[PDB]
Design a binder for this molecule. Structure first.
Ligand SMILES: O=C(Nc1cccc2cccnc12)c1ccc(N2C(=O)[C@@H]3[C@H](C2=O)[C@@H]2C=C[C@H]3C2)cc1
Ligand SMILES: [Zn+2]
Length: 207
């Protein structure tokens, strides 16, 4: 059911999406170990993901959440990185494929910092890096992230160094030590996120 619509670099949508990618890069405490050393990306392609069934299941869940939260879905646009992006855009997010550990357990993770989601493209801690060079800082190989519409509803606040807690619809991971880090978010039900944009990019070696 999925079609991918290529956006042109002068489309206003391409530009606002690229600006959110670029402007949310930060430095990471691993000094670039997991995601590579970079201050900006080379954006190669932004595609709009169109799937009617996945959209209808997103908006249906969104209305349920909203009606339980004084008419407030608390919808955000957030990045998601994982090795399974190409499965996700065809079949939707699935909590059954969620990995057992991590800071917030077996959920589907999103991030406000595109650089945080970039650390997961090749797996946890960056896995072995790119398939071709095994370089977690590869400046050559094309990477992909999703920029996703996510329904958070009443989110449980976790001050920070499976299912949502009872009475909540997601978890907000709130950075409590690092001054520059933005929030991460976790949902436990695949239907509460729609992957709107597939972004293809390279990290760039700083001059
Ligand atoms: O929906 C996901 N994957 C998939 C959806 C639909 C079909 C799939 C088929 C095969 C594999 N994954 C699929 C998915 C769920 C959770 C994660 N996920 C996270 O969000 C966190 C963890 C994870 O597995 C660790 C990797 C990224 C962070 C850290 C990744 C992908
Ligand atoms: Zn490579």
């Amino acid at each position: 059911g999925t079609i991918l619509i290529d956006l042109s670099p002068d489309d206003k949508e391409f530009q606002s999406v690229e600006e959110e990618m670029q402007s949310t890069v930060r430095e990471h405490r691993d000094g670039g170990h997991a995601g590579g050393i970079f201050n900006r990306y080379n954006i190669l392609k932004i595609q709009k993901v169109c799937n009617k069934k996945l959209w209808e299941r997103y908006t249906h869940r969104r209305k349920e959440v909203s009606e339980e939260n004084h008419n407030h879905a608390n919808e955000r646009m957030l990045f998601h990185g994982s090795p399974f992006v190409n499965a996700i855009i065809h079949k939707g997010f699935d909590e059954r494929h969620a990995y057992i550990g991590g800071m917030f357990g077996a959920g589907i993770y999103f991030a406000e910092n595109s650089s945080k989601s970039n650390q997961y493209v090749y797996g946890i801690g960056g896995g072995t890096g790119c398939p071709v060079h095994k370089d977690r800082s590869c400046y050559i190989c094309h990477r992909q992230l999703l920029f996703c519409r996510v329904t958070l509803g009443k989110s449980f606040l976790q001050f920070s160094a499976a299912h949502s807690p009872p009475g909540h619809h997601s978890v907000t991971g709130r950075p409590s030590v690092n001054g520059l880090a933005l929030a991460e978010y976790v949902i436990y039900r695949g239907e509460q996120a729609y992957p709107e944009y597939l972004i293809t990019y390279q990290i760039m070696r700083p001059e």
